[PDB]
Amino acid sequence: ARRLVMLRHGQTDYNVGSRMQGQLDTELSELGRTQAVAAAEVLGKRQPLLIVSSDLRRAYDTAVKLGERTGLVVRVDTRLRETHLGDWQGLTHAQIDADAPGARLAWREDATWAPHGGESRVDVAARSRPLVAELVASEPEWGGADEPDRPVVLVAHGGLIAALSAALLKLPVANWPALGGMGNASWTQLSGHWAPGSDFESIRWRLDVWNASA
Amino acid sequence: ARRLVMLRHGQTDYNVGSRMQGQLDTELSELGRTQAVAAAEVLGKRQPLLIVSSDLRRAYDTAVKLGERTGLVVRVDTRLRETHLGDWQGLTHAQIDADAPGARLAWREDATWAPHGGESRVDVAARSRPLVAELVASEPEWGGADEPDRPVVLVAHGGLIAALSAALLKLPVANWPALGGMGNASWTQLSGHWDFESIRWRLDVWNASA
């Protein structure tokens, strides 16, 4: 059984502001930076197998604190980026509710709806899920012979983790909105179970932890 | 929104044995007693509005430690008991897999299936969910005007919390196996957003520790 940990980046300025980030390369705040250190303490004790991070700085800076703690290099992948929010990026909840009222609240309940020029949850999962399959195929150590509980740690963003977790869990798309939003420097854990020798689509994923804090 | 927190009891003098408990009234271990004291510190700071506990001692003992920290009377409800596991109660995984190879692993994947004389996951949800419906209609302070964040704390068991959460989340029954098992002195939090079937529940936290 393979353990997969996903960690949301620490607080940014936009978070405090309720301003849609998407794929804008915003910076960690000081509190956010200290949050990543606290999180690296807890996740570090689990002895990760490897760290893969979003290339956006707020996730990358968070991941690096874990890498320091563990002595592990941080690999980078654009497929771990937050939902692209299109024309909404850089606008706040207040501003969005003015132009197209109800649109934002409708968005959280429909994993297929995308802001104009952005991605839906379904889009983000199509983009990130193969990364997990690659890692399944590339790391025989993972859930394997020697130390089968050492996790793979993805450092990313709230939307991505919800979209990717729902997809790995093979939840119907109608139920993806059931997963509430993760906190800053909080993590989620799925465990991958396969009948010995089986394919990637034959792996059954179970939700171990959703949104634990440090 | 209404915050609903479900807390699993601390370690017992039994879990380590890989022995199905079900509704066996097993006791906390010494760690369990200290874990319940630990959890009450964390959940106590959130100041619950009320505490409802299973009558199984391992949950009841845990709840009382939260109740002491908070000054709350602990309500008791048999509807919060763990899944009754029928002929499996008290047997080890080794014995069950010897009697019925595959049945145990097949069981964790089918929320409708019950060991002979037991309950299914669906059974546990049907008996426990009306307690949630009662509370929503019974406590207007919950998510109310002055202090809308005061949570309701159900102190129960891993099987029940998985089944009840999945039911409140209105997941298809085929998808209930996605919610894995909670650890000793772990908690789960759903929030209720806008009748009672018209309430939409969101998973805020699943299986956080202390």
SS (H, E, C) chain B: CEEEEEEECCCECCHHHCECCCCCCCCECHHHHHHHHHHHHHHHHCCCCEEEECCCHHHHHHHHHHHHHHCCCEEECHHHCCCCCHHHCCCEHHHHHHHCCCHHHHHHCCCCCCCCCCCCHHHHHHHHHHHHHHHHHHCCCCCCCCCCCCCEEEEECHHHHHHHHHHHCCCCHHHHHHECCCCCCCEEEEEEECCCCCCEEEEEEEEECC
Tell me the structure's resolution in angstroms, rounded to a single decimal: 2.5
Closest CA to A84 of A114, A111, A42, A45: A114
- C-alpha B175/C-alpha B110 separation (Å) is 9
* Partner-chain contact B207 A206, CB within 8 Å: no
Which of B109, B191, B208 is closest, CB to CB, to A212? B208
Of residues A163, A132, A206, A192, the one with CA closest to residue B109:
A206
Structure token pair of residue A147: 């130390």
Strand partners, B75: B52
Number of domains in chain B: 1
Query: What part of B 13-72 touches A (C-beta under 8 Å)?
Result: none
CB A51 within 8 A of CB A75: yes
Task: Output the six-digit token pair for B132.
Answer: 């949630």
User: Using the beta-carbon criterion (under 8 Å), do A206 and B177 form an inter-chain contact?
Assistant: yes
CA atoms within 13 A on the CB side of B141: 7
- Contact assessment for residue B164 and residue B125, using Cβ atoms and an 8 Å cutoff: yes
| Residue A204 annotated as binding site | no
- Cβ neighbors of A205 (< 8 A, separation 6 or more) are A4, A168, A169, A170, A190, A191, A192, A193, B178
Set of chain A residues whose Cβ sits within 8 Å of the Cβ of B178: 169-171, 205-207
Q: What residues make up the domain containing B6? A: 2-208
Q: Are the beta carbons of B206 and A205 separated by less than 8 Å?
A: no
- For the beta sheet containing B187-193, the strands, ordered from the edge strand earlier in sequence to the opposite edge, are A74-77, A50-54, A152-156, A2-8, A187-193, A204-212, B200-208, B187-193, B2-8, B152-156, B50-53, B74-76
CA neighbor of B58 nearest in space, from B118, B4, B13, B88: B13
Place of tokens 């920290």: B69
Distance CA B111, CA B75 (A): 28
Catalytic residue list contains B134: no
Look up tokens 């309430």; give the residue. B199
Q: Any catalytic annotation for residue A9?
A: yes
B176/A contact by beta carbon, under 8 A: no
Q: Is A18 left (phi over 0), alpha (psi -120 to 50) or beta?
A: left
**Cα B72 to Cα B59: distance, rounded to the nearest angstrom:** 16
Query: Which residues of chain A make contact with B208, given a CB cutoff of 8 A?
Result: 209, 211-213
Q: Report CA-CA distances (Å) from B6 to A107, A114, B158.
A: 28, 34, 9
Q: Is the CB of residue A112 less than 8 Å away from at least one CB of chain B?
A: no
Q: Which of A5, A110, A168, A210 to mutate to test the interface with B (most CBs of B within 10 A)?
A: A210
Q: Is A1 on the interface with B (CB under 8 A)?
A: no
B88: domain CATH number?
3.40.50.1240
- B105 in contact with A at a CB cutoff of 8 Å? no
Contact yes or no for B7/B58 (Cβ under 8 A): no
B191 touches B202 (CB < 8 A): yes
Experimental method: X-ray
Burial label, B197 (beta-carbon count in 10 A; 0-12, 13-18, 19+): exposed
Query: Distance from CA of residue A157 to its chain's centroid?
Result: 4
